[PDB]
Amino acid sequence: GSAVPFHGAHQAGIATPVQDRLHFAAFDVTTEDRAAFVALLKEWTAAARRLTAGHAVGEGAYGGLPEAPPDDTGEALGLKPSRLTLTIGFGPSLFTRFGLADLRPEALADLPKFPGDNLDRARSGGDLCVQACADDPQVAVHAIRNLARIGFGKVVVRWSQLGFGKTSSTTPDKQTPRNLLGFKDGTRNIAGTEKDRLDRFVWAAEKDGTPWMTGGSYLVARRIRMHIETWDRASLQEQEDVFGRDKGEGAPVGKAKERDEPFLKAMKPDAHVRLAHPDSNGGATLLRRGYSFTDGTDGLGRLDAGLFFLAYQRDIRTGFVPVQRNLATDALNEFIQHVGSAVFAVPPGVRDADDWWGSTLF
Amino acid sequence: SAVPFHGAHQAGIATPVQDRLHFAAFDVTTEDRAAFVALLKEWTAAARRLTAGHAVGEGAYGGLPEAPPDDTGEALGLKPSRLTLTIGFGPSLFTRFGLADLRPEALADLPKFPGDNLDRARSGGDLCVQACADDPQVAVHAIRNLARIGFGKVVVRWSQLGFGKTSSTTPDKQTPRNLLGFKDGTRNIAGTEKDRLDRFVWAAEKDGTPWMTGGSYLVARRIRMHIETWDRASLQEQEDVFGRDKGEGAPVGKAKERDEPFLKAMKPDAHVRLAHPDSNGGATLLRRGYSFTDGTDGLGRLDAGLFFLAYQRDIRTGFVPVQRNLATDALNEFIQHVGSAVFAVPPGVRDADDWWGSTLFG
Ligand code: HEM
Numbered sequence: 001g002s003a004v005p006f007h008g009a010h011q012a013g014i015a016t017p018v019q020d021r022l023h024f025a026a027f028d029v030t031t032e033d034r035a036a037f038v039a040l041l042k043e044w045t046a047a048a049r050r051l052t053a054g055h056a057v058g059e060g061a062y063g064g065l066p067e068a069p070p071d072d073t074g075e076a077l078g079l080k081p082s083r084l085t086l087t088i089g090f091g092p093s094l095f096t097r098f099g100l101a102d103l104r105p106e107a108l109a110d111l112p113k114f115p116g117d118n119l120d121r122a123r124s125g126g127d128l129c130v131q132a133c134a135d136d137p138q139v140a141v142h143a144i145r146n147l148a149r150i151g152f153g154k155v156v157v158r159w160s161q162l163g164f165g166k167t168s169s170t171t172p173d174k175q176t177p178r179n180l181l182g183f184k185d186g187t188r189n190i191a192g193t194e195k196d197r198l199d200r201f202v203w204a205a206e207k208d209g210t211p212w213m214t215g216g217s218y219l220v221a222r223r224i225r226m227h228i229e230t231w232d233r234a235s236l237q238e239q240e241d242v243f244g245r246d247k248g249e250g251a252p253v254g255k256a257k258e259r260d261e262p263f264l265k266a267m268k269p270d271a272h273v274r275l276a277h278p279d280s281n282g283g284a285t286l287l288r289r290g291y292s293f294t295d296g297t298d299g300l301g302r303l304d305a306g307l308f309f310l311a312y313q314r315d316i317r318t319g320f321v322p323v324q325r326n327l328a329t330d331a332l333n334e335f336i337q338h339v340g341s342a343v344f345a346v347p348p349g350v351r352d353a354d355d356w357w358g359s360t361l362f
Numbered sequence: 363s364a365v366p367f368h369g370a371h372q373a374g375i376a377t378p379v380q381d382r383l384h385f386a387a388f389d390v391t392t393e394d395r396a397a398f399v400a401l402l403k404e405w406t407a408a409a410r411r412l413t414a415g416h417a418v419g420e421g422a423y424g425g426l427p428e429a430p431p432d433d434t435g436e437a438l439g440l441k442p443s444r445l446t447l448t449i450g451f452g453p454s455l456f457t458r459f460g461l462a463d464l465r466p467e468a469l470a471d472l473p474k475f476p477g478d479n480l481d482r483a484r485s486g487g488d489l490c491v492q493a494c495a496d497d498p499q500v501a502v503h504a505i506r507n508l509a510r511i512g513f514g515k516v517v518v519r520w521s522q523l524g525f526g527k528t529s530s531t532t533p534d535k536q537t538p539r540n541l542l543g544f545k546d547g548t549r550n551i552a553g554t555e556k557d558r559l560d561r562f563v564w565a566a567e568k569d570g571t572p573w574m575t576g577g578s579y580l581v582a583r584r585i586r587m588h589i590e591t592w593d594r595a596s597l598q599e600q601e602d603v604f605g606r607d608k609g610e611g612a613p614v615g616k617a618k619e620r621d622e623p624f625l626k627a628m629k630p631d632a633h634v635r636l637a638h639p640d641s642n643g644g645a646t647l648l649r650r651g652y653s654f655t656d657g658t659d660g661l662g663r664l665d666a667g668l669f670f671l672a673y674q675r676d677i678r679t680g681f682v683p684v685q686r687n688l689a690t691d692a693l694n695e696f697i698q699h700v701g702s703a704v705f706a707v708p709p710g711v712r713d714a715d716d717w718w719g720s721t722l723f724g
């Protein structure tokens with residue numbers, strides 16, 4: 001129920017312990033006025049400080065002028081902060097506006113086409129994003145709703161994704177959650193306590209070439225549909241061979257315990273863990289922070305199921321891209337399809353009460 | 363921790379309201395009564411395991427490597443989470459298996475109501491399973507595994523996830539707010555009110571359909587809210603729509619949420635005034651709905667609302683009169699009914715040898 005501090009050198013919602021729920025929204029910008037956009041970032045920052053402490057935005061949800069709409073939509077009244085974090089990112093397309101073209105980071109790379117991609121353009125891209133994570137879904141929806149309302153006339157929602165449950169871990173001392181394939185997902189991640197690994201693999205450094213991004217990170221989002229009919233008729237051995245870990249304990253093949261270190265040569269050559277492991281990718285390491293989704297039925301008699309994959313890294317070119325390229329032969333590809341994609345530059349943190357989202361850029 | 367599965371009544375109606383919902387409607391594909399009965403028995407066996415926090419069948423792992431696991435595994439390590447599984451039978455089921463003369467008269471087809479915009483794909487269904495739990499993954503796991511067990515005999519027609527409160531951080535007594543920011547549930551039938559349940563919720567033998575004794579009738583309505591239009595309404599307009607204030611949820615002219623309403627102080631077309639039993643010849647409902655937020659539609663608007671569930675002793679004397687009286691509701695400007703289904707919810711599974719539907723199939 002507690003609040004996660006909002007201010008810091010880094011934005012919260014990355015290294016932070018992974019909360020139970022996600023509401024992710026991508027927005028397109030509809031104003032050409034730089035000053036108006038800056039004003040929105042400041043207003044959004046002010047709102048975020050209230051929301052993340054469990055307070056209503058503006059002058060509140062009620063008790064104002066009867067003839068005016070309330071400043072806060074009211075559906076989070078009486079709720080705790082619920083570990084809400086709000087993380088903003090800027091997409092490549094943003095840099096075509098406001099005279100920003102020369103400030104686009106080289107590390108904000110467009111992704112290549114990957115074999116098997118079937119990307120829906122409507123649910124891909126975006127000028128900016130807000131990742132809202134919280135333990136209470138109502139708290140997360142309220143946050144995104146109120147930001148969108150404040151932004152009316154300057155930004156529009158392009159696409160959104162709700163995640164009903166986490167499939168990631170930044171806290172190895174707590175139970176690793178399972179994805180909808182039934183396997184633990186998050187065992188070998190980066191922990192929020194691993195400051196050296198965060199500095200090496202997640203946070204942008206000044207020397208990386210883009211000073212305004214120092215202390216920020218880069219985010220890849222992939223919406224991945226799972227072929228659960230196909231998966232559910234596979235044998236136990238086939239499922240375990242796909243990953244290289246057993247299903248019950250999630251230990252590497254041959255070993256007893258989840259957190260025993262993988263011995264890669266015992267896995268099949270196309271096993272997901274073997275292909276994705278840093279040692280298979282010149283050391284490339286990611287912070288994975290995704291969530292599961294189900295968006296109804298597929299109209300063919302089955303549940304829709306997927307995983308909204310989020311990865312944070314210091315450079316897209318040295319993080320997601322090499323690892324995904326190495327998954328071209330993954331045995332898991334038989335059971336998944338990537339159907340949405342976006343990348344974002346996640347700026348540094350809001351340092352104090354006078355700072356604002358995007359201040360280093362603008 | 364858990365809710366007993368066996369009883370004179372199915373759990374999930376009068377038992378404590380859990381934080382999360384996964385509701386699925388199924389269509390039956392077999393014409394073979396014996397095959398359907400066999401399914402109902404297998405589903406009951408699975409429900410007994412699921413509601414106790416155990417995997418279905420021989421488990422999620424540790425069986426023959428060359429066989430698919432009996433349970434898909436995504437709830438391993440989770441708690442029972444107060445899971446309840448409540449089955450119901452739609453009118454269309456009664457056109458199969460020689461059942462036409464056993465359709466209860468209380469299982470009435472709904473009339474067309476003014477402003478209905480029903481999506482046929484998200485309406486109807488031969489059967490439903492209401493899965494309620496505090497952990498959405500427990501609920502989803504239940505539905506996914508029942509659907510898998512039934513594959514070849516049933517298909518999933520439509521599915522809806524929902525949420526109420528988050529009990530870890532929100533006190534049990536506190537009325538949840540809906541997504542319009544109003545407290546929702548103040549004047550309802552509570553599960554403690556045994557005589558009101560007998561009067562208004564449970565079917566009795568003398569009502570005309572003996573197999574339904576101890577069951578109930580369910581109306582489901584997927585009700586979209588026009589969030590962005592609502593949020594532009596003044597505070598006074600919002601309060602006028604309901605007849606209660608937004609902050610406290612007290613009836614107009616009263617001080618406290620639970621103060622009894624004085625209906626004449628409310629506007630004639632205020633929702634509470636139109637819906638109140640006194641305005642409907644005493645008609646009283648058990649509401650057990652959940653909020654939903656599915657994402658954003660093509661115009662960038664929030665696809666959100668109330669998945670309305672009402673239980674009643676007879677649809678003709680519960681939902682139908684009350685919804686008819688809402689023809690002129692001030693709330694209609696801000697909502698649209700977009701899915702509908704009705705179900706007969708059979709009596710409880712009495713003991714370990716009983717099975718869902720046994721009073722109907724014999
Ligand atoms: C639906 C899609 C996916 C599923 C179901 C999945 C599942 C898994 C599982 C079960 C593990 C082992 C436990 C763990 O260490 O977390 C794992 C590990 C991992 N996955 Fe995936 N994964 C998916 C997609 C991806 C993608 C798209 C990437 C990157 C492009 C990726 C990168 C990794 C990495 C880096 C590891 C850790 C390997 C190691 O260092 O041991 N995964 N995944």
Ligand code: HEM
Nearest residue numbers: 540544545546547548549585634637638639668684685697
């Ligand atoms: C999105 C749609 C709806 C919303 C947002 C909504 C909201 C509310 C709110 C805020 C209250 C007052 C607090 C309470 O006593 O629960 C209420 C009461 C009530 N609603 Fe609705 N409602 C909706 C749809 C319906 C429908 C479809 C029906 C029935 C056909 C219904 C029947 C009732 C009843 C019976 C009451 C209690 C009235 C009383 O006895 O005081 N509502 N609703």
